[PDB]
Design a binder for these strands. Structure first.
Ligand SMILES: [Cl-]
Ligand SMILES: [Cl-]
Ligand SMILES: [Cl-]
Ligand SMILES: [Cl-]
Ligand SMILES: [Mg+2]
Lengths: 121, 97, 100, 83, 99, 92, 111, 100
DNA sequence: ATCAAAACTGTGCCGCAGTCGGCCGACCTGAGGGTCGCCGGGGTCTGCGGGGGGACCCTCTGGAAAGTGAAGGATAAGTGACGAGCGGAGACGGGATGGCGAACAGACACAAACACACAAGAGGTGAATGTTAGGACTGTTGCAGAT
DNA sequence: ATCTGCAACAGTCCTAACATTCACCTCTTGTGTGTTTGTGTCTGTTCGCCATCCCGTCTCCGCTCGTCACTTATCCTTCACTTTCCAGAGGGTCCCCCCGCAGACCCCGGCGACCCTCAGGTCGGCCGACTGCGGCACAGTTTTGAT
C-alpha cells in the first residue's frame, strides 16, 4: 500500500487556480534559483482574485447592456470603467474591445437652453 | 498524431467565472484575453519578485517577495484585497492540512 | 425638396456615437494587409504571414490611432479650435515622447 | 496599378472613422496625409521587431506571437492572440 | 540713471543662464524637510541616507524641468507665451499621468 | 543644563511651501519658459507632491521588504527605475 | 596549467569577459550560458562605452576641460540621435539640459 | 579605523578607464561621471541579458548563446548603433573561438 | 413657441455556428515519500552616519510699486471642411487545389555544467604629487535701453 | 543714429579638493584541467494552413457641388505678470552630541532541490447540441430642421 493519495495544494488552499502549475512555472521561468512553498499559493490566490474582479465587473457587463455571454467588449467596458483595473492595464490593448463612449462637451451644441449646467463638474 | 496540447488557464478562469456568474457564459476570444491577462500579471509579479530577491541577495522567491511585489504592482485597494486573499490562502493552506 | 442636408457637424457628431459604440476594425482589411506585406518587404524578402498576425497588427494599429486621435482632439481643443490639424497630431506625438 | 495604393490604401474615409471613434468632430484636410505617415512609422517599428523575432527562430512565416512580443517590448501590449 | 530692462529680457537672460548650468535649483534643506514629511506620513521610524535625498531631488528636478518643457509647448500651441495650469494639465494628460 | 537635555522629534508641517516661487521659477527657466502664470506655483507644488509621493511610497516599500528602517539611495534608485524614470549616478 | 590567458585577451576586448559570464550565470536569465554569449555582450558594452566616451571626451575638450564630468555625458548623449533614444527614459544626475529656447520667445526683431 | 574588512564592491570602473585612455589618452573622468558610466554599462547589460533570456523562452531553448545576444542587441539598440554593435560582437566571437 | 423628414430600437423569427457537457483517450504532470546540500533566520558586536542644534556669514526670499505688453474679447472677412447625390470599382463573401513550411520526433555528438587546486586580477588603503576646477578680483566686449 | 551702463566672458593669482600613481596587502575569483548529465543539432515525416486564381453581390470610395460655420487676422481694453528695491529670514557650512541600526560574522536547523513511481487532472478530439445570437424586416419613439 503506497498510502492513500489525493489532496491538491489548490484544495489545501481552497483555491480555484493551479497552485502546482504555478510553482512549476516559477521554478522554470528563471525567476530565482529556488521558489518557496508559500509563493505559489500566494500567487495563485492573487491571480484568482484579479480574474474574479474582472469577471465580476465583466458579468454585470452583459446585464446593464443585456446578453449572457462575455465578449471582449464587456471586458473592456469593465476595465476602463473601473479606475483601479484601468491603471493596472493602462498600457494594454484588449482586442476587439473598442473604446468608451465619450464626447467632449464643447463639440456638441445646444446653444438655446435645456438645463444650463456648469456648476457641478 | 496530436498537438503537444497547449496549457491554458481556461479551465480555472471558467470555474471562477461561475462562483461569480453561473448565469453568464464566456466568449471564445474573450477567454483568451483572460488567459493573456493572467500570464501578464503572473510575469509582472514573478519579475518584480525576482528583482526583490536579487536586490536583497537572496536565492529564493518567497511569499514575502510575492507580497511586496503585489504592493508595488497593484493600485490601492486592488492591492489591499489581493494581499488579503494572499495571506488568507497561504494560512488556510499552512494550517488546514 | 432639398438634399435635406443637416447642420455641418451633426452627422459627424452621430458618426462618433456609432463608432464609439462599435468594436470592428475601420481600416478595410485587404488594403491594410497589402500595406503590411509592403513594409515587411524591406526587412526580409519573401516571407509568409498567418492571417491572425495581420489581425493582431491591424488590431494594434487601430487602437494606437484612435488613442492618438483622442490626444490630438484634446490638443485642438486646447488651442481653442474644434478642427484637428496636423500641428496637433504632432504636439501630441512630441509630448508623448514618440517624437522625443 | 503597380501598387498605386498600399501605403496609400488606408483611405480618407477609414481615417475619418478611426478619428470619430476617437471623438473628433471636424477634421482638417492635410490630416489624412499626416495620419498615413504616422501609421506607417508605427508599422515599420512593430514589424521590424516582429520579423526580428521570426528570423531568430529560423522561420519564414510571421506568427501572432512574433507580433505580440513585438508590441509588448514596444510597450503596446496586446491581449487576444498572445496566449 | 534709473535703468530697467523690458519685461522678458531678464526672463530670457535666465533661461539662458539656467540651461547652461547643472546645479540643483530647489534649495537643499527645504527640499529635504518635504521628503522627510511625505515619508514620515507613510511610515514612522524612517531615516534617510543623504544620498537618497540627493537622488530624490535629482529625479524630481529633472522631472519638473521636462514637464515645464511640454507645458511650454502646450502654451505655445495655444498661441501663448505664458504657461498656465491648463497647460500643465494637457501635458500630464497626454503623457498618460492624469488620464 | 550641561550634559544632555533630550531633544524632541521635530514636527513637520507645510513643507511643500519650501518649494518657493523663485525655485519653481528657476526650474521653469531651465525648461525654457519665458512667462509664468500666477496660478502655476500651487499647481507645481501639487504635481511635485504627487510625484514625490509615488516614488517615496515605492522606495519605502523596498526599504521595509528588506527589514531596514533606513531608506538608501538604491531604494530610491529601484523605485525610480520601476516607474520608468531610471536614474544614473547613485549606484544601480 | 599553461600560465593563464584571460578570456578577454583571447577576444581582444578590454571589458572582463569572465566577469560577464559570471553575472549572466547568477542573474538567472537561463539555466545554461553559452561560451560566446559573454564574449559578444562584453564586446557590445565596450563598443557602447567607447561611443559615449569618445563624444564626452570631445565635449569636455570643447569646453576647455580635461576631466569629463556628468554635464559632458549629457551633452554627448542628448546631441546624438541614437544614443538619445537608447537613453530616452534615463536621467543623468547633474547633466542639465540642452540649451534651447523656442523661437517665438525671442525678442521680436521689430520695434 | 579598526579591523572590520570593508566589504568588497566591484564595478566596470577600470575597464571604462582603459577604453577612455584608448580614445582620449590625455583625458580623465570625475568620480560622478564614472559612477554614471558604471550605471550605463549595468543598465544595458540587464537590458540585453533580459531580452536574451526572454528570447530563449519563446524558443523553448534553455541556453543563452550568442544568437540570443545578437538578436537582443538588434531589438534593443537604435539604428546604426546595432549594426556597429552586431559587428563588433561577432568580430570578437570569431577572434575568440579561433585564436587560442 | 409648435410642426415635418430621418435615423436608432428592441422585438420577432430563423438559419450558421458557437460554446457545452460529456465520453473517453491519452498522456503528461503534480503529488506522495524520502534523501540531502546549503540557504536563510538568529544572536552579537559595533562603527558609521542621521537627526538635532549652535554659531556665523551672506545670499536669496518676499513684498510692495510702477509700468507695459500679453491675453482675451469683439468683430469682420475669406474659405475650408461638411452634407449629399451617385456612379462603378475593387473589397468581400464562398470554394477549391497545390505545396511550402512549421511542428514533431528519434538519436546522439559535444557543449556547458560541476569539482577543484591555484595564481594574480581586482579591490581597499594611505600617500606623495599633482593637476584642476571653484572663488574672488579685474579688464574687454556685446548689447539693451536711454536721448 | 550716438551713448551710457549693466551683463556676460576671460585672465589671473590662489588654495582646498579631487585625482592619479605608487606598492602593498588580503583574497575573491577567473582560469587550467578532467569528468559528466542532457540540450541543441540534424535528419526525417505529417499535415496544417498559407498563398491564390476564381467568381457573383454591392457596399463603399471618389468627386463635383452648394454654402455654412469655423478659423483667423484685427483692433481695443483690462490688468496680470515682469522688474526693482531692500530688509532680514533662513539656507549653507562647520562642528558636535547622542545613538539607532546597517552590515559583517558565525552557527546550524529546516527548507526546498532532486529522485522515483503513479493516479488523475488536464487537454484534444468528436458529438450532438442546447441556445446563442447576428441577419434581415416592422412599427415606434427620438430627434434635428423650419414656420
Ligand atoms: Cl515561501
Ligand atoms: Cl497644421
Ligand atoms: Cl489654467
Ligand atoms: Cl554562445
Ligand atoms: Mg506627519
Amino acid at each position: 500500500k503506497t498510502r492513500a493519495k489525493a489532496k491538491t495544494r489548490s484544495s489545501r488552499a481552497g483555491l480555484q487556480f493551479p497552485v502546482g502549475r504555478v510553482h512549476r512555472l516559477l521554478r522554470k521561468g528563471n525567476y530565482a534559483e529556488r521558489v518557496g512553498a508559500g509563493a505559489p499559493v500566494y500567487l495563485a490566490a492573487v491571480l484568482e482574485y484579479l480574474t474574479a474582479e474582472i469577471l465580476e465587473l465583466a458579468g454585470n457587463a452583459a446585464r446593464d447592456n443585456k446578453k449572457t455571454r462575455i465578449i471582449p467588449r464587456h471586458l473592456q467596458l469593465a476595465v476602463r470603467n473601473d479606475e483601479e483595473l484601468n491603471k493596472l492595464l493602462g498600457r494594454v490593448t484588449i482586442a476587439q474591445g473598442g473604446v468608451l463612449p465619450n464626447i467632449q462637451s464643447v463639440l456638441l451644441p445646444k446653444k438655446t437652453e435645456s438645463s444650463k449646467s456648469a456648476k457641478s463638474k | 498524431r496530436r498537438k503537444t496540447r497547449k496549457e491554458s488557464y481556461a479551465i480555472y478562469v471558467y470555474k471562477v467565472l461561475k462562483q461569480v456568474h453561473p448565469d453568464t457564459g464566456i466568449s471564445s476570444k474573450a477567454m483568451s484575453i483572460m488567459n493573456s491577462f493572467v500570464n501578464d500579471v503572473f510575469e509582472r509579479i514573478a519579475g518584480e519578485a525576482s528583482r526583490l530577491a536579487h536586490y536583497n541577495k537572496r536565492s529564493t522567491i518567497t511569499s514575502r517577495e510575492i507580497q511586496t511585489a503585489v504592493r508595488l504592482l497593484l493600485p490601492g485597494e486592488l492591492a489591499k484585497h489581493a494581499v488579503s486573499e494572499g495571506t488568507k490562502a497561504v494560512t488556510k493552506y499552512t494550517s488546514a492540512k | 425638396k432639398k438634399p435635406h442636408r443637416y447642420r455641418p457637424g451633426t452627422v459627424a457628431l452621430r458618426e462618433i456615437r456609432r463608432y464609439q459604440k462599435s468594436t470592428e476594425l475601420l481600416i478595410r482589411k485587404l488594403p491594410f494587409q497589402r500595406l503590411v506585406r509592403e513594409i515587411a518587404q524591406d526587412f526580409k524578402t519573401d516571407l509568409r504571414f498567418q492571417s491572425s498576425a495581420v489581425m493582431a497588427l491591424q488590431e494594434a494599429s487601430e487602437a494606437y490611432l484612435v488613442a492618438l486621435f483622442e490626444d490630438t482632439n484634446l490638443a485642438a481643443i486646447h488651442a481653442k479650435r474644434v478642427t484637428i490639424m496636423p500641428k496637433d497630431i504632432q504636439l501630441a506625438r512630441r509630448i508623448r515622447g514618440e517624437r522625443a | 496599378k503597380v501598387l498605386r495604393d498600399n501605403i496609400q490604401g488606408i483611405t480618407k474615409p477609414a481615417i475619418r472613422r478611426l478619428a470619430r471613434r476617437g471623438g473628433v468632430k471636424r477634421i482638417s484636410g492635410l490630416i489624412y496625409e499626416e495620419t498615413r505617415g504616422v501609421l506607417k512609422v508605427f508599422l515599420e517599428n512593430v514589424i521590424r521587431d516582429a520579423v526580428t523575432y521570426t528570423e531568430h527562430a529560423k522561420r519564414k512565416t510571421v506568427t501572432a506571437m512574433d507580433v505580440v512580443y513585438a508590441l509588448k517590448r514596444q510597450g503596446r501590449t496586446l491581449y487576444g492572440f498572445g496566449g
